[PDB]
Short mmCIF file of C-alpha atoms in Angstrom, two decimals:
data_model
loop_
_atom_site.label_atom_id
_atom_site.label_comp_id
_atom_site.label_asym_id
_atom_site.label_seq_id
_atom_site.Cartn_x
_atom_site.Cartn_y
_atom_site.Cartn_z
CA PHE A 1 11.19 -18.52 7.33
CA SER A 2 11.17 -21.48 4.46
CA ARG A 3 12.90 -24.57 6.35
CA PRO A 4 16.24 -25.02 5.46
CA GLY A 5 16.65 -28.23 2.49
CA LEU A 6 13.30 -26.34 -0.03
CA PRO A 7 15.42 -26.99 -4.26
CA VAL A 8 15.78 -22.95 -4.28
CA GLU A 9 18.27 -22.39 -7.23
CA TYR A 10 20.16 -18.26 -7.65
CA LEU A 11 20.03 -18.28 -10.82
CA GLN A 12 21.87 -14.95 -13.08
CA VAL A 13 19.74 -13.84 -15.82
CA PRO A 14 20.73 -11.61 -18.93
CA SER A 15 18.83 -8.87 -19.12
CA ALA A 16 19.99 -7.14 -22.90
CA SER A 17 17.34 -4.72 -22.22
CA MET A 18 18.73 -2.72 -18.95
CA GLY A 19 22.56 -4.85 -20.21
CA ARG A 20 23.25 -6.47 -17.13
CA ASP A 21 22.36 -9.69 -15.61
CA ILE A 22 19.51 -10.10 -13.18
CA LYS A 23 19.39 -12.69 -9.68
CA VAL A 24 16.16 -14.39 -9.43
CA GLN A 25 15.68 -17.33 -6.71
CA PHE A 26 13.90 -20.10 -8.58
CA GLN A 27 12.02 -22.90 -7.17
CA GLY A 28 11.48 -25.41 -9.30
CA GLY A 29 7.78 -27.28 -8.82
CA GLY A 30 5.56 -26.92 -11.86
CA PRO A 31 5.56 -25.96 -15.12
CA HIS A 32 3.71 -23.36 -14.33
CA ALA A 33 4.44 -20.46 -12.35
CA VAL A 34 4.28 -17.57 -8.82
CA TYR A 35 5.75 -14.59 -9.73
CA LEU A 36 6.80 -13.31 -6.35
CA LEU A 37 7.43 -9.43 -7.30
CA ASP A 38 8.51 -7.13 -4.78
CA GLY A 39 7.75 -3.57 -2.35
CA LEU A 40 9.60 -0.41 -2.91
CA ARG A 41 12.56 -1.04 -0.93
CA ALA A 42 13.63 -4.35 -3.45
CA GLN A 43 16.62 -5.26 -2.64
CA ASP A 44 19.70 -7.00 -4.40
CA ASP A 45 20.42 -9.93 -2.21
CA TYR A 46 16.89 -10.52 -1.06
CA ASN A 47 13.70 -10.79 -2.76
CA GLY A 48 11.60 -9.67 -0.38
CA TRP A 49 8.78 -12.51 0.15
CA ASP A 50 12.19 -14.21 1.19
CA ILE A 51 13.99 -12.53 3.31
CA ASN A 52 10.39 -12.38 5.14
CA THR A 53 8.11 -15.33 4.51
CA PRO A 54 7.80 -18.81 4.27
CA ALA A 55 6.93 -18.38 0.52
CA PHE A 56 9.05 -21.35 -0.88
CA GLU A 57 8.08 -23.45 2.19
CA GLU A 58 4.29 -23.25 1.27
CA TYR A 59 4.71 -23.90 -2.36
CA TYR A 60 6.89 -26.11 -2.04
CA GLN A 61 5.22 -29.50 -3.42
CA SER A 62 2.24 -27.16 -5.01
CA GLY A 63 2.37 -28.17 -8.15
CA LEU A 64 4.00 -24.44 -8.87
CA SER A 65 6.64 -22.81 -9.27
CA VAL A 66 7.92 -19.50 -8.10
CA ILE A 67 9.39 -17.38 -8.82
CA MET A 68 11.14 -14.28 -7.08
CA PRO A 69 13.66 -12.32 -8.73
CA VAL A 70 15.34 -9.89 -7.01
CA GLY A 71 16.26 -5.93 -7.49
CA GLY A 72 14.65 -3.43 -9.58
CA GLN A 73 14.78 -0.75 -5.78
CA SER A 74 11.68 1.59 -6.65
CA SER A 75 11.51 0.56 -10.29
CA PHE A 76 7.04 -0.23 -10.68
CA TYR A 77 8.64 -3.38 -12.81
CA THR A 78 7.91 -1.05 -15.40
CA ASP A 79 9.48 0.14 -18.47
CA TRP A 80 11.38 3.94 -17.76
CA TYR A 81 11.80 6.47 -20.31
CA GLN A 82 15.43 6.81 -19.85
CA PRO A 83 17.91 6.25 -16.69
CA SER A 84 16.64 8.32 -13.29
CA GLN A 85 17.42 11.51 -13.68
CA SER A 86 19.02 12.92 -10.19
CA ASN A 87 20.57 9.43 -8.34
CA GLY A 88 23.09 8.18 -10.88
CA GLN A 89 21.76 5.50 -12.66
CA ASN A 90 23.56 4.83 -15.62
CA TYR A 91 20.84 1.97 -17.11
CA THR A 92 17.52 2.67 -17.86
CA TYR A 93 14.77 0.27 -16.01
CA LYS A 94 13.96 -2.31 -18.50
CA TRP A 95 11.64 -4.28 -15.66
CA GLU A 96 8.53 -5.12 -17.61
CA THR A 97 10.80 -6.65 -20.78
CA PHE A 98 12.72 -7.97 -18.35
CA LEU A 99 9.59 -9.96 -16.95
CA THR A 100 7.15 -10.45 -19.76
CA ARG A 101 10.30 -11.57 -22.47
CA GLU A 102 13.38 -12.01 -21.13
CA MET A 103 12.80 -14.49 -18.27
CA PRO A 104 10.12 -16.51 -19.39
CA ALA A 105 12.49 -16.85 -22.35
CA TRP A 106 14.93 -18.66 -20.15
CA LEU A 107 13.25 -20.40 -17.83
CA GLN A 108 11.49 -21.83 -21.35
CA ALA A 109 14.26 -22.45 -22.09
CA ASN A 110 16.47 -24.53 -19.34
CA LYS A 111 14.05 -25.28 -16.67
CA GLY A 112 10.87 -26.13 -18.66
CA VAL A 113 8.96 -23.17 -17.27
CA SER A 114 5.95 -22.25 -19.38
CA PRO A 115 5.27 -18.95 -20.95
CA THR A 116 1.74 -19.17 -20.18
CA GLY A 117 -0.87 -19.69 -17.49
CA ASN A 118 1.28 -18.06 -14.95
CA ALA A 119 0.59 -15.82 -11.81
CA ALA A 120 1.22 -12.70 -10.95
CA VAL A 121 1.71 -11.12 -7.39
CA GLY A 122 2.73 -8.06 -5.95
CA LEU A 123 2.21 -6.03 -2.60
CA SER A 124 2.50 -2.34 -2.07
CA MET A 125 4.81 -0.71 -5.08
CA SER A 126 3.78 -4.21 -7.47
CA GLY A 127 0.30 -4.42 -6.34
CA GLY A 128 -0.33 -2.58 -9.25
CA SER A 129 2.16 -3.66 -11.88
CA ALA A 130 1.03 -7.30 -11.08
CA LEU A 131 -2.72 -6.19 -12.41
CA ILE A 132 -0.54 -4.11 -15.57
CA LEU A 133 0.95 -7.27 -16.42
CA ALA A 134 -2.63 -9.23 -16.18
CA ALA A 135 -4.25 -6.42 -18.40
CA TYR A 136 -1.60 -6.20 -21.51
CA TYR A 137 -0.51 -9.18 -21.30
CA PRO A 138 -3.47 -12.27 -20.63
CA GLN A 139 -1.73 -14.80 -21.48
CA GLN A 140 1.48 -15.24 -19.55
CA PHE A 141 -1.08 -14.27 -16.70
CA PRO A 142 -5.06 -15.25 -16.53
CA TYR A 143 -4.09 -14.51 -12.76
CA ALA A 144 -2.83 -11.98 -10.69
CA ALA A 145 -2.93 -10.85 -7.10
CA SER A 146 -2.20 -7.06 -5.85
CA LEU A 147 -1.82 -6.64 -2.21
CA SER A 148 -1.70 -3.11 -0.59
CA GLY A 149 -1.32 -1.61 -4.40
CA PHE A 150 -2.03 1.50 -5.08
CA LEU A 151 -3.97 0.98 -8.10
CA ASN A 152 -4.90 4.43 -9.22
CA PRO A 153 -1.50 5.46 -9.66
CA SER A 154 -2.16 8.24 -12.98
CA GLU A 155 -5.04 9.67 -10.26
CA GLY A 156 -4.72 13.45 -8.36
CA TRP A 157 -1.72 13.68 -5.84
CA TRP A 158 -0.88 9.99 -5.95
CA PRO A 159 1.51 10.96 -9.39
CA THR A 160 3.20 13.26 -6.78
CA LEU A 161 2.47 10.86 -3.75
CA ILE A 162 4.71 8.08 -5.72
CA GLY A 163 7.52 10.67 -6.10
CA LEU A 164 8.13 11.65 -3.46
CA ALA A 165 8.27 7.30 -2.21
CA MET A 166 10.74 7.55 -4.34
CA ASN A 167 12.84 9.29 -4.00
CA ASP A 168 12.90 8.52 -0.66
CA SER A 169 13.92 5.20 -1.49
CA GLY A 170 17.43 5.29 -3.47
CA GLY A 171 16.14 8.62 -4.36
CA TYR A 172 14.75 8.26 -7.66
CA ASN A 173 12.63 10.28 -9.84
CA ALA A 174 9.10 9.12 -11.56
CA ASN A 175 9.38 12.04 -13.91
CA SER A 176 12.22 9.87 -15.53
CA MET A 177 10.00 6.54 -15.18
CA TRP A 178 6.71 7.46 -16.83
CA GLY A 179 7.29 11.38 -17.63
CA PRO A 180 4.94 14.36 -15.55
CA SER A 181 1.14 13.00 -14.68
CA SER A 182 0.12 14.32 -18.09
CA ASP A 183 2.38 11.54 -19.83
CA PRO A 184 0.29 8.62 -21.43
CA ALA A 185 2.10 6.62 -19.50
CA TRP A 186 0.73 7.26 -16.90
CA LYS A 187 -2.43 6.04 -17.89
CA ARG A 188 -1.28 3.13 -19.60
CA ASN A 189 0.05 2.14 -16.32
CA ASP A 190 -3.01 2.52 -14.32
CA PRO A 191 -4.82 -0.51 -12.82
CA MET A 192 -8.22 1.90 -12.33
CA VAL A 193 -8.33 2.60 -16.00
CA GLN A 194 -6.98 -0.76 -17.53
CA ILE A 195 -9.78 -2.40 -15.58
CA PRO A 196 -11.48 -2.82 -19.13
CA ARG A 197 -8.38 -5.04 -19.96
CA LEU A 198 -8.82 -7.06 -16.87
CA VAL A 199 -12.95 -7.84 -18.20
CA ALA A 200 -12.66 -8.65 -21.27
CA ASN A 201 -9.94 -10.83 -20.54
CA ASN A 202 -11.55 -12.35 -17.99
CA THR A 203 -8.24 -12.72 -16.06
CA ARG A 204 -8.90 -14.13 -12.24
CA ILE A 205 -7.77 -10.73 -9.90
CA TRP A 206 -6.87 -11.55 -5.70
CA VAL A 207 -7.11 -7.87 -4.16
CA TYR A 208 -6.19 -7.52 -0.72
CA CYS A 209 -6.36 -4.44 1.46
CA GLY A 210 -5.69 -3.82 4.95
CA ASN A 211 -6.86 -0.76 7.88
CA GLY A 212 -3.91 -0.49 8.69
CA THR A 213 0.07 -1.88 10.13
CA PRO A 214 0.89 -2.90 12.86
CA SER A 215 2.21 0.33 14.84
CA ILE A 216 -2.44 10.30 12.08
CA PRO A 217 -0.87 11.22 8.88
CA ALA A 218 -0.17 7.71 7.81
CA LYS A 219 -3.87 7.30 9.32
CA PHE A 220 -4.79 9.87 6.41
CA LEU A 221 -2.85 7.47 4.01
CA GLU A 222 -4.33 4.28 4.31
CA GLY A 223 -7.85 5.33 4.25
CA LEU A 224 -7.00 6.81 1.37
CA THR A 225 -5.25 3.65 0.50
CA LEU A 226 -8.16 1.59 1.11
CA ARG A 227 -10.92 3.75 -0.32
CA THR A 228 -9.05 3.64 -3.63
CA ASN A 229 -8.90 -0.60 -3.69
CA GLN A 230 -12.64 -0.39 -3.24
CA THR A 231 -13.57 1.99 -5.88
CA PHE A 232 -11.04 -0.71 -7.75
CA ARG A 233 -12.97 -3.10 -6.65
CA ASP A 234 -16.92 -0.87 -7.66
CA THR A 235 -15.29 0.26 -10.69
CA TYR A 236 -14.31 -3.57 -11.64
CA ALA A 237 -17.78 -4.85 -11.28
CA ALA A 238 -19.52 -2.12 -12.87
CA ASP A 239 -17.17 -2.27 -15.80
CA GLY A 240 -18.51 -5.84 -15.91
CA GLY A 241 -16.28 -7.81 -13.91
CA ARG A 242 -17.30 -11.18 -12.23
CA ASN A 243 -13.65 -13.20 -12.13
CA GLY A 244 -12.53 -11.20 -8.61
CA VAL A 245 -11.84 -11.70 -5.04
CA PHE A 246 -11.97 -8.31 -2.59
CA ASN A 247 -10.11 -8.77 1.03
CA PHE A 248 -10.98 -5.58 2.59
CA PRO A 249 -10.72 -8.03 6.60
CA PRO A 250 -10.92 -4.49 9.12
CA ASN A 251 -8.62 -6.40 11.46
CA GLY A 252 -6.06 -6.61 7.51
CA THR A 253 -2.46 -4.96 8.33
CA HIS A 254 0.07 -3.94 5.29
CA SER A 255 2.09 -5.69 6.96
CA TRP A 256 5.00 -9.29 5.62
CA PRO A 257 2.80 -11.75 8.28
CA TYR A 258 -0.67 -10.44 6.12
CA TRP A 259 0.20 -10.25 2.83
CA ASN A 260 1.80 -13.79 3.43
CA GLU A 261 -0.90 -14.78 5.33
CA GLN A 262 -2.68 -14.22 1.56
CA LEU A 263 0.26 -15.90 -0.21
CA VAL A 264 -0.95 -19.29 1.47
CA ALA A 265 -4.49 -18.01 0.69
CA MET A 266 -5.09 -17.55 -2.31
CA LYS A 267 -2.90 -20.71 -3.07
CA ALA A 268 -5.87 -22.84 -4.36
CA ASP A 269 -6.96 -20.53 -6.04
CA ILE A 270 -3.93 -20.49 -8.06
CA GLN A 271 -4.06 -23.61 -8.81
CA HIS A 272 -7.32 -24.41 -9.55
CA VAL A 273 -7.37 -21.33 -12.09
CA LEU A 274 -3.78 -22.42 -13.87
CA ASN A 275 -3.16 -26.34 -12.84
CA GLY A 276 -7.40 -26.26 -13.73
#
């Protein structure tokens, strides 16, 4: 979708913590950057944002760099306890370490991208991830967006539902990631639980949730997902949050066209927060 000729590079960025090189699609355009995180079925060739949207073209000459890490199927962009126990994964996912230490160090030294003052933007799987990244690394991420995110992953049925989704997407094991649902890692990585961090740090947060996919069990799931997002909004407000944008248009969909529309819509917001 992005027109050809844009200054998009394909970088090999070593991850010491994962023992392998991570491919990163990169468009330079300023010291502060938008980190575009992929969904549950993240591929190893291209980030879903580049496959499905004109994101690079839309942010060309925005005054912001654009970073699209490639890979991490079912990873939740988190640091796992162990290699996924069932599908033969022969290393441990350490994607939080990659995104908060290894990759920004690489981009600082080699490109001049600032490790501080950036935006994390995620969808589906990574909507919660973006918020968690800002919750724990507020200097790196004064801005976070969650598009159709799952924002109370530790609560009720959600750890089991997440486990089911991860198994469907490449046979990954949620127990290898954050342990049993009683493990402290589930609450650590739950955006709802970490709302006080988002408030204390005055993070700019952009939260979108659609009402369905363009295409009954799915209808129940989507209603539950919207309700979790609305509860997140309500809890954020109750805990003193004052720096959020909450987009719940009834005709909004869970689709790459609407997630792209949100990415374009938030551009001015990110520019104002990161570049003043």
